Every structure is written in C-alpha cells, then in structure tokens.
Design a protein around this ligand. Structure first.
Ligand code: COA
Ligand code: COA
Ligand code: KAN
Ligand code: KAN
Ligand code: PAP
Lengths: 176, 181
C-alpha cells in the first residue's frame, strides 16, 4: 500500500538482487544490464508484501538542458510492478513516493514512457514532450529520434515550453 | 546501540526539513569565507547530505550528488562531493573524517567512483584516506562540445570503487552552471 524510499547505498546485497531480479522479470527480458546501471545512484521507491519486493521505481539525478540551462532533474527508471500484483494501482503508490522526491529536491522530473503507459503518467500531471529530443554526446549535441514521443516531464518550480528542444546528458545504452 | 554522537547521518535533499536546509546553507556559506555562491549551493542539492549534529545545530556537512564523469569514452557513475565544511568553532577535531566515513560508504554502495575538487590544504587529508589525485588534464562536456578546464587541473581527487582508472588520462565532467568541477 505505501512505498518506502531507500537510497542505493542503503540497499543490502540481498535487497539489491531482489530488486534487480524483480524488475528484470517484470520487463520480460527487455531490460539490459545498462538499463539496470541506470536505476542506480538515487532513491528507490519499494513496496514489499511479506518480505517480497512487489513494486519498484527509482529516481536518479541528472541534468536536462532546456533553453541553455542545465536543469536539476529527477529521472525515473525501472518502474515495475510484479506481474501477479498488477491492476491494484501499486504503481500509484510508487509514483507518490518518486514525485515527493521530485518536489523536495529537483526542478523537474522526467522519464521515458512506452506508448501504453502514457495514460498513467499523463493522468498524474506529467506532460508529453513534443519538441525534438537530443543528447549532449561527447562529440556535441546529437538528436535522439528513437526516443521522440516517449519523454514526459513533471515541472516543479517552472512553466516549460514543451515544444522547445530538450537535451539529456550522456550515458551508455539508452540515453533516455 | 550507543548514542551515535557525532556520527554523520545521511539525509536526502528531499527529506531535509526547511529549518535544517536553511541551517546547512548558512553554515556551509559561512564556512567558506565569502567564496560560496548561490550556484555552489545549487550544486549541493539532489543527493545525500552527510550531517553531524551538535545541540540541534549542523556543525559539519558534505553532500554526495550524482553526475557522470567521462573517462576513455565511458560515462562513469560518479558520486561528487560538494560543500564539505566543518563549522569553524568545531575545526581541528577530525570531524571531517566522520563526514568522509559516510561519504565513502555512499561511494562504495552506489557509484563507480567518488570525485571532488580539493584545496591544496586538504590534499593530504584525502590522500591519506586512499583518494587518488587526478594528474591528467581536466575538461567539461559543454553544450558546444568538450572544453578544457585548466583552472581545475591539479585539484581533482577520485575514489575508484572496484574499477581501475589511469589517473594520468583526460577526465571530462558533465555540464552545469557555475563551476563545473
Ligand atoms: C506499467 C505497470 C508498472 C503498471 O502497474 P500497475 O500497478 O499494475 O498499474 P495499474 O493498476 O494502475 O494498471 C495500469 C494498467 O495495467 C493494466 N492491467 C490491469 N490489470 C492487469 C493484470 N492483472 N496483468 C497485467 N496488466 C494489467 C491495465 O491496462 C491498466 O489500465 P487502467 O488502470 O487504465 O485500466 C506494470 O504493468 C508493469 O510493471 N509493467 C511492465 C514494466 C513496464 O512496462 N514499466 C513501465 C515502464 S514506463
Ligand atoms: C577542510 C575542513 C572541512 C577540515 O575539517 P576539520 O574537521 O577541522 O579537519 P581536521 O580536524 O582533520 O583538521 C584539518 C587541518 O586543519 C588545521 N586546523 C586545526 N584547527 C584549525 C582551525 N581551527 N581552523 C582552521 N584550520 C585548523 C590543522 O592544520 C589540521 O591538520 P592536522 O590535523 O594535520 O593538524 C575545514 O577546515 C573547513 O570547513 N574548511 C572550510 C571549507 C573548505 O575549505 N572545505 C573543504 C573543501 S576541499
Ligand atoms: N527497456 C527498459 C526501459 O524501458 C523504459 O524506457 C525505455 C522506453 O520504453 C523506450 O521506448 C521504446 O519502447 C517502447 C515500449 O515498447 C515504445 O512504446 C517506444 N515507442 C520505443 O521508443 C525508449 N526508446 C528508451 C527508454 N529507456 C523504462 O522507462 C526504463 O526505465 C527501462 O529501463
Ligand atoms: N567555491 C565553493 C566551492 O569550493 C570547493 O570547490 C571549488 C574549488 O575550491 C575551486 O578551486 C580553486 O580554489 C581552491 C581553494 O582556494 C584552490 O586551491 C584551487 N587551485 C582553485 O582552482 C575549483 N576551481 C572549483 C570547485 N567547485 C568545494 O569543493 C566546493 O564544494 C564548493 O562549492
Ligand atoms: N571542543 C569544543 N569546541 C567548540 N565548541 C564546544 C566544544 N566543546 C563544547 N562546545 C560547546 O561549548 C558550549 C558548552 O559546552 P557543554 O554543552 O558541553 O557544557 P557543560 O560542560 O556544562 O556540560 C556548548 O555550546 P552551545 O552552548 O552553543 O550549545 C558546546 O557545544
């Protein structure tokens, strides 16, 4: 019913493995070792039932460049509810915890959604990015057309022109 | 369990009550004698603050924030240490060692390396604990592309976590306003 927030460095090895395995199975294989690396470093929202982790979402810190400013961003990764626990709105409890972190620490939240999860985020006030997305790669700005149509943002202490360019910072694997 | 007196406590920025957040900001700003800007304050936000309490006031602070440092084309997951400060009346009692015990525990548990910018005076402290001085040229991946940061050469220290870094190579931090390192 309610998620508990734990920083990566506060996860014991057993809990870390339990999280990785649950998230990985929830994605049915579509979750790579670099996707797992992207869930580390920040706050994990976790819901347990009788000692088993049944839901997870992580919010990690990065910068998103918007109109020349490198905005302090809480980026959401690894959102997953164990299959047998789906359809009980557990994801709402995960997102209440992640959005609380955003309000207290960041200028905006952001994330990359599948087409079917778009409704979930929009219903909570997240906004679909309509402008071109890019990544500040080591060679300079590079457009990321495969991620267009997947980015959502949650403004905290700003109004955003969601049809402007948005440029994430660099990492391996999927940059968004 | 004992009283935990002067053990640093790790608190995420989002879990700081407003009174504590203001005490940290005024304590760190005053500990730097005029050299800590509002952009330096922004740089302490978003991660875990290691705090040492005495009589309900913050007497020491160090924040570990997440960023990427690019090494040989690899964007390493870095815990970057900002705002390291011990209030002046409490200096010379090794409280910075208690802040660093917490900072280094956060690196081992969550990042591929710790990194920070050290004054010449503090170099010895970091080196005695195992941090390595970065000898290679530093740069930042600005929106226009890579650009050297010569003023930051000779100041960066790193704490690799089970990875091997050639500390004579180029190291390029990611972008942000104000001082990038
Ligand atoms: C997306 C996900 C986190 C939603 O979690 P949840 O707690 O089940 O969400 P909800 O209960 O609010 O249901 C969301 C939708 O899931 C679907 N659903 C309902 N019961 C389900 C079940 N028993 N089995 C599978 N899917 C189900 C419905 O389409 C529902 O839509 P609606 O609420 O508008 O009617 C979860 O399906 C999951 O982990 N999916 C795989 C990982 C993934 O895609 N994560 C999101 C990446 S952006
Ligand atoms: C750097 C700092 C955090 C060290 O904290 P600390 O808990 O006082 O550290 P230590 O007790 O290990 O003392 C460090 C050195 O300070 C010196 N010192 C002792 N008392 C001191 C005082 N009252 N004021 C200044 N320096 C003092 C000694 O040279 C000591 O070295 P020693 O133990 O080899 O004799 C603290 O001086 C500080 O807050 N400085 C201002 C902010 C800053 O520069 N931050 C660090 C950025 S790299
Ligand atoms: N794989 C695991 C990851 O999955 C999601 O993120 C990814 C999106 O799903 C991708 O979207 C693509 O796949 C969707 C679903 O098939 C399509 O709808 C969409 N048009 C496609 O572009 C997008 N390109 C990258 C992004 N990292 C989670 O948020 C992320 O935490 C998790 O690590
Ligand atoms: N200003 C407030 C900040 O100060 C330190 O970091 C700054 C270093 O002090 C700078 O270094 C310069 O000043 C040192 C001390 O005089 C000299 O030794 C050195 N050779 C100089 O280049 C460096 N260029 C940027 C770095 N952000 C703290 O770590 C940081 O958390 C805090 O926000
Ligand atoms: N070694 C120290 N360096 C600087 N401040 C100190 C040190 N030891 C004690 N203090 C402070 O000096 C003050 C008096 O110390 P105590 O609280 O330990 O008093 P006590 O001996 O009567 O039990 C306290 O500050 P405060 O009144 O502003 O809260 C205490 O924190």
């Amino acid at each position: 019913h309610t998620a508990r927030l734990v920083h990566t460095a506060d996860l014991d090895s057993e809990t870390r493995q339990d999280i990785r395995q649950m998230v990985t199975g929830a994605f049915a294989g579509d979750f790579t070792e670099t996707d797992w690396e992207h869930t580390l470093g920040g706050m994990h929202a976790l819901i347990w039932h009788h000692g088993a982790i049944i839901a997870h979402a992580a919010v990690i810190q990065r910068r998103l460049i918007y109109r020349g400013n490198a905005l302090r961003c809480g980026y959401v990764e690894g959102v997953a509810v164990r299959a047998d626990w789906r359809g009980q709105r557990l994801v709402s409890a995960l997102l209440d915890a992640v959005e609380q972190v955003m309000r207290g620490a960041y200028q905006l939240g952001a994330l990359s959604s599948s087409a079917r999860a778009r409704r979930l985020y929009a219903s909570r006030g997240w906004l679909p990015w309509h402008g071109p997305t890019s990544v500040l790669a080591p060679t300079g700005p590079v457009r990321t057309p495969d991620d267009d149509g997947t980015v959502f943002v949650l403004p905290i202490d700003i109004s955003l022109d969601t049809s402007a360019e948005l440029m994430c910072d660099w990492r391996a694997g999927d940059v968004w």
